[PDB]
C-alpha cells in the first residue's frame, strides 16, 4: 500500500493524441518577424 | 484487504475460486485450462483502471 | 506517472512454497528491493533512474487464507506430520545450479 | 396537474433490518478530512477506487546524481 513515481519517461503509447489528424509539419497560426 | 487492482475485497474474492473448483486454501495455484470452459469465472473477468 | 496501488504479491521459493504451517510460535523477517533499476523492465531498454523516478512505501501486510474445518482433525493430522520420518520436502523444476 | 392526494398511507409497506454501513438511509453529503474529497450516498463515483495519494519530492533529486560523466 502506497505510491509509485514512474517519471517523465513513462510512455504507454507512441504517436499523437492531440491534433492527430495532421500531415508532417502542418503549421499552427503564427507570425514571421523578418 | 483489497484484491489486486480493484476495490473488490478478499472477503468476496476467495468465494468464487473455491465455489466451483478445488483451488484456494491449499496455498495459491493458477486455474487449469480445461476448468474454465467458455466463461466460467475468469474468461469474462479482466480487472482494469484509468 | 503517479499511481496509488495495492498489488497483491506471493513468494517464489524452492522449499517454502507448498508446505504446511503447524501450531506454535513463528517470526517473519524478509527484505524487499526498493530501486527502479532492478525491479522494472522497459520496452525500449530505458533505466528509470537518471529520469526522475522512485518507489515509495506506506503500509505492508502479511495475509493468509486459512482452511476452515472441525478443530479435532486440525490438530490430529499435524500430530501425524510431527514425526521424524513423516515430514515435508519440496523441489523445483530448476533445482539446477548456475555458473557463468 | 396533480400526481399524489394529501393524506398518503405509510404503514402499509413493511419495515425490516437495515445494514449500518456507510450512507444506507439518507443521501447525506458527508465531507472528509484535509486530504480526501466529498462523496454522496447514491453517486456513480462511489463504485470505483476514488483515492487520494501522491509524495514525489525524493524522485527528482535521487536521479540527479548522475550529472558528471
Curated annotation (Swiss-Prot), chain A:
Described purpose of this protein according to its UniProt entry: Major capsid protein that self-associates to form 240 hexon trimers, each in the shape of a hexagon, building most of the pseudo T=25 capsid. Assembled into trimeric units with the help of the chaperone shutoff protein. Transported by pre-protein VI to the nucleus where it associates with other structural proteins to form an empty capsid. Might be involved, through its interaction with host dyneins, in the intracellular microtubule-dependent transport of incoming viral capsid to the nucleus.
Assigned protein family: Belongs to the adenoviridae hexon protein family.
Quaternary data: Homotrimer. Interacts with the capsid vertex protein; this interaction binds the peripentonal hexons to the neighboring penton base. Interacts with the hexon-linking protein; this interaction tethers the hexons surrounding the penton to those situated in the central plate of the facet. Interacts with the hexon-interlacing protein; this interaction lashes the hexons together. Interacts with host dyneins DYNC1LI1 and DYNC1I2; this interaction might be involved in intracellular microtubule-dependent transport of incoming viral capsid.
Other remarks in the entry: All late proteins expressed from the major late promoter are produced by alternative splicing and alternative polyadenylation of the same gene giving rise to non-overlapping ORFs. A leader sequence is present in the N-terminus of all these mRNAs and is recognized by the viral shutoff protein to provide expression although conventional translation via ribosome scanning from the cap has been shut off in the host cell.
Gene: L3
Compartments, as annotated in UniProt: Virion; Host nucleus
Induction statement: Expressed in the late phase of the viral replicative cycle.
Protein name: Hexon protein
Curated annotation (Swiss-Prot), chain B:
Site, as annotated: Involved in interaction with pre-protein VI: 24
Membrane-spanning residues: none
Subcellular location: Virion; Host nucleus
Expression induction: Expressed in the late phase of the viral replicative cycle.
Domain of life of the native organism: Viruses
Note in the entry: All late proteins expressed from the major late promoter are produced by alternative splicing and alternative polyadenylation of the same gene giving rise to non-overlapping ORFs. A leader sequence is present in the N-terminus of all these mRNAs and is recognized by the viral shutoff protein to provide expression although conventional translation via ribosome scanning from the cap has been shut off in the host cell.
Family: Belongs to the adenoviridae hexon protein family.
Subunit (UniProt): Homotrimer. Interacts with the capsid vertex protein; this interaction binds the peripentonal hexons to the neighboring penton base. Interacts with the hexon-linking protein; this interaction tethers the hexons surrounding the penton to those situated in the central plate of the facet. Interacts with the hexon-interlacing protein; this interaction lashes the hexons together. Interacts with host dyneins DYNC1LI1 and DYNC1I2; this interaction might be involved in intracellular microtubule-dependent transport of incoming viral capsid.
Protein name: Hexon protein
Boundaries of the shown chain within the full protein: 754 to 803 of 952
Curated annotation (Swiss-Prot), chain D:
Record flagged with keyword Coiled coil: yes
GO molecular function: hexon binding
Disulfide bond sites: none
Source organism, top-level taxon: Viruses
GO BP term, pick one: symbiont entry into host cell
Subcellular location: Virion; Host nucleus
Physiological role: Structural component of the virion that acts as a cement protein on the capsid exterior and forms triskelion structures consisting of three molecules that stabilize three hexon trimers at the center of each icosahedral facet and fixes the peripentonal hexons. Dispensable for assembly. During virus entry, recruits the anterograde motor kinesin-1 to the capsid docked at the nuclear pore complex thereby subjecting the docked capsid to a pulling force.
UniProt name for this protein: Hexon-interlacing protein
Top-level taxonomy: Viruses, Varidnaviria, Bamfordvirae, Preplasmiviricota, Tectiliviricetes
Gene that specifies this protein: IX
Amino acid at each position: 500500500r502506497g505510491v509509485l513515481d514512474r517519471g517523465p519517461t513513462f510512455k504507454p503509447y507512441s504517436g499523437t493524441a492531440y491534433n492527430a489528424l495532421a500531415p508532417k509539419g502542418a503549421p499552427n497560426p503564427c507570425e514571421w518577424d523578418e | 484487504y483489497n484484491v489486486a487492482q480493484c476495490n473488490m475485497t478478499k472477503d468476496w474474492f476467495l468465494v468464487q475460486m473455491l465455489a466451483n473448483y478445488n483451488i484456494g486454501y491449499q496455498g495459491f495455484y493458477i486455474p487449469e485450462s480445461y476448468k474454465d470452459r467458455m466463461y466460467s469465472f475468469f474468461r469474462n473477468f479482466q480487472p482494469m483502471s484509468r | 506517472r503517479y499511481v496509488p496501488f495495492h498489488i497483491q504479491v506471493p513468494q517464489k521459493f524452492f522449499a517454502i512454497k507448498n508446505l504446511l504451517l503447524l501450531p506454535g510460535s513463528y517470526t517473519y523477517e524478509w527484505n524487499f528491493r526498493k530501486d527502479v533499476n532492478m525491479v522494472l523492465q522497459s520496452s525500449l531498454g530505458n533505466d528509470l533512474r537518471v529520469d526522475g523516478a522512485s518507489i515509495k512505501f506506506d503500509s505492508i501486510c502479511l495475509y493468509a487464507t486459512f482452511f476452515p474445518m472441525a478443530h479435532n482433525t486440525a490438530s490430529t493430522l499435524e500430530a501425524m506430520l510431527r514425526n521424524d520420518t513423516n515430514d515435508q520436502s519440496f523441489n523445483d523444476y530448476l533445482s539446477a545450479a548456475n555458473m557463468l | 396537474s396533480t400526481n399524489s392526494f394529501d393524506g398518503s398511507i405509510v404503514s402499509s409497506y413493511l419495515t425490516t433490518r437495515m445494514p449500518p454501513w456507510a450512507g444506507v438511509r439518507q443521501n447525506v453529503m458527508g465531507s472528509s478530512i484535509d486530504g480526501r474529497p466529498v462523496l454522496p450516498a447514491n453517486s456513480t463515483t462511489l463504485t470505483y477506487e476514488t483515492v487520494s495519494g501522491t509524495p514525489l519530492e525524493t524522485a527528482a533529486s535521487a536521479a540527479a546524481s548522475a550529472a558528471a560523466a
